[PDB]
């Protein structure tokens, strides 16, 4: 066995052929040790070796078969094991194998052929290691059968060609199919055959891992046209649609669901969450989510810019004492919290989120852990406001020594690491330029643009508003790009004229008013303003000039709150503005 | 004309000098019966026109430059900024005491054509000519709690019916219409969920915003062939001006009270919403 993993080729082509030749006389018991090093020839070159590779598990699917023998779980598990790779046989890199492979699967009795069950075998042989191709491989063997014929052969060549022609062409197929298997297998069979339908669908969507939009969109759109399928997974299609950027084909399906029952409304406010479309966020929660005096009294000063009163009326809507007129369903627990994070994060609350995110789901001190990490409620929507609140806070100057080390520990593994480099990094960046590993966050803001590509690609070509949200950070991720690319430049500090140049650059170039709202500018303005003081750090009458653009800076953060009708947030800011502005007279006035 | 709007130095270096017109014209099928012209431009492009005579028009320019001054206030604001809100004014421009022209646009519908043919053979011809019709059963009606055969009989209706008998007769005409004909409209013709979802919001915000507005100076008159739906980006524009202030409950004989058109239609497009989250709030900022 050692030998065989080496590294030579006509080695491990006669390795394989004498482990083809003393084939039916070895015992099954070693067969599930023997047939592990067998498998890891896939990623390897030269037709010649994985050719012997999948002669041999054509016979292993042949004659292990066990109908029904009921002799081991090795005996019955090689069968699984070998089926996952004679599958995965069909995407390699050398065609006429794959003429060999698929002759085997449309073989007399390896799927059977009579119209239908045919697709429903087809369903059956999945396996999401593939998923990409599914579809054209699928409608390859559902028209195979077919025996005014010169246009059907191109469309099965053009059919392998782009994503969009094959899902059209599936969802036209199979919904052809389901149509007209009217002719028999009565209502008893058409029921039985949708369980097993609706099964195999719950199946493919809980299987998937490295999501794909037209595959996604297919079955999302198939089950949207029969009378069965409807009730699919009101809890996993959300989350798909949540990060596969294919929300308003869900929305669609959760719409025909509903028409002709709570779980489905709160996950469609997590769908309408992310795309926009407040209007019908909020006419949703004084419909289902709902039936108290609180929330119809919070919604109606959570519509207009009264960013406070909605949030003072949530604290006594969770810890209320008796409330003997009927109680808190299964509904609106979660909201009001919920809801009680967003319209604190829509103000300046970075004292006092922190502790409604996370001291809701453990002991009194934060223990913050695996806790936050496993049970992934506590870490799609806790855990965001979270790490926002914790940076937001730490940015302005402080120790508070807990991010730090959270962090340090959170990026070791696979499932710790893929997620806080695959979504964010960008405050991430900013922490480790903190940290002062800047070519580490080199590479965060690379990987943060390049996400941004990944991101805008995939958005569609007039949903509008997810657009404009997903476009507006830009501002954000050039402004660090230039504090790094202007402190790795040397002739800053022994000089001033470009100190003065990056002055009336920021003073010029801005966002505006009335059409950026307050947590955009809310963050360009922090992150700047933190970029004078980490730039008067560096440089170890600038402080007046810093004060000054800084005051402007924030000045104009005011007339903005001001002219978007925030009148607490600009309130505050002149509060904590009041004896800040008794060092001037000008700035007083 | 049509240009000198005022806003700055005007220049005729760029405006469009005639210089042709077209061996067509094109009748429009009505009571009025306008024709429409196709004329040219020396800067190389083409302007339709519609051309009505016999109507004194110099009211409806005065409230399209209230139009314009009334959309220049709902962009001046910022959260109406945010969602971008405009009424989509057009220039009438008044040639002479009556005669005047109709700046025209471009494949719009009206609102009781996207009605009919969006139905199929059977409910286009049942809401045009059935024996219970629901223009029919609503005359029978009359004469049912009326007794006479003419105009007078509406004016009799409010002193021979309760309330909730009219409701019931109300719902048995409710009835006879199905629910979702807008979103059988659109799902006619948009051949995509990823664009349904924004023609039926663009949809929702155009009829919201010019409900809100025609209530302001009232106009009362608001029938079907006053929205010309345009197919091309999913909005509504309104036409056809009758009463200019609070006028059309006063002088008519048989008064109406309501503010503007919201149907069974409008509220079964927004199902499975009630109609509550985003008319509401639209109407409200």
Sequence with gaps: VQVMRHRDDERQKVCLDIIYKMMPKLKPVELRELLNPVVEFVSHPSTT???????????????????????DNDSQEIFKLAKDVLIQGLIDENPGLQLIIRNFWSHETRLPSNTLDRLLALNSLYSPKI??????????????????????????????????????????????????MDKFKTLSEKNNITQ?????????????????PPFVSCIQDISCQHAALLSLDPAAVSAGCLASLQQPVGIRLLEEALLRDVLRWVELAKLYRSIGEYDVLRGIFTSEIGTKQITQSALLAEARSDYSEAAK????????????????????????????????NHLAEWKSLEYCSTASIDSENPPDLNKIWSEPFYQETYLPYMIRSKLKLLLQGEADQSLLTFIDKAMHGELQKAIL?????????????????????????????????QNYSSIDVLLHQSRLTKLQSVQALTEIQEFISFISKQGNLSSQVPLKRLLNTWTNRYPDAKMDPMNIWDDIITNRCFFLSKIEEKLTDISSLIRSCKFSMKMKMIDSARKQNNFSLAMKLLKELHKESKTRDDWLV | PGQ???????????????????????????????????????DEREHPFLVKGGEDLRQDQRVEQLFQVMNGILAQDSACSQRALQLRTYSVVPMTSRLGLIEWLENTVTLKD??????????????????RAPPCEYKDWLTKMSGKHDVGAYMLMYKGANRTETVTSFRKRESKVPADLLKRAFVRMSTSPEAFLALRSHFASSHALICISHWILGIGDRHLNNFMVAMETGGVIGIDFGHAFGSATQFLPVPELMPFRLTRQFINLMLPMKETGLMYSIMVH
């Design chain 1, 421 to 453: 480099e695959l979504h964010y990094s960008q405050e991430l960046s900013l922490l480790y330029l903190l940290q002062d590993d800047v070519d580490r966050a080199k590479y965060y803001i690379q990987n943060g643009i390049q996400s941004f590509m």
């Design chain 2, 4 to 42: 000198y709007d005022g806003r700055g130095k005007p220049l005729p270096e760029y405006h469009v000098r005639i210089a042709g017109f077209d061996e067509r014209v094109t009748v429009m099928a009505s009571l009025r019966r306008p024709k429409r012209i196709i004329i040219r431009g020396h």
């Design chain 1, 196 to 212: 097993k339908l609706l099964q195999d669908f719950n199946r493919f969507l809980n299987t998937t891992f490295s999501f794909f």
């Design chain 2, 114 to 131: 996207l009605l009919l043919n969006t139905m199929s053979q059977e409910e286009k011809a049942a809401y045009l000519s059935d024996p």
């Design chain 1, 131 to 180: 998923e990409v191709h599914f579809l054209s491989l699928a409608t390859n063997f559902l028209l195979e059968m077919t025996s005014h014929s010169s246009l059907i052969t191109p469309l099965q060549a053009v059919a392998q060609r782009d994503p969009i022609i094959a899902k059209q062409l599936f969802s036209s197929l199979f919904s052809g199919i389901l149509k007209e």
């Design chain 1, 313 to 344: 009326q949530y604290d006594e809507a969770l810890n209320k004492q008796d409330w003997v007129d009927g109680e808190p369903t299964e509904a609106e627990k979660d909201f009001w919290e919920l809801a009680s994070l967003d319209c604190y």
């Design chain 1, 49 to 71: 070796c994985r050719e012997q590779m999948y002669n041999i598990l054509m016979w292993i699917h042949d004659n292990y078969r066990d109908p029904e023998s009921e002799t």
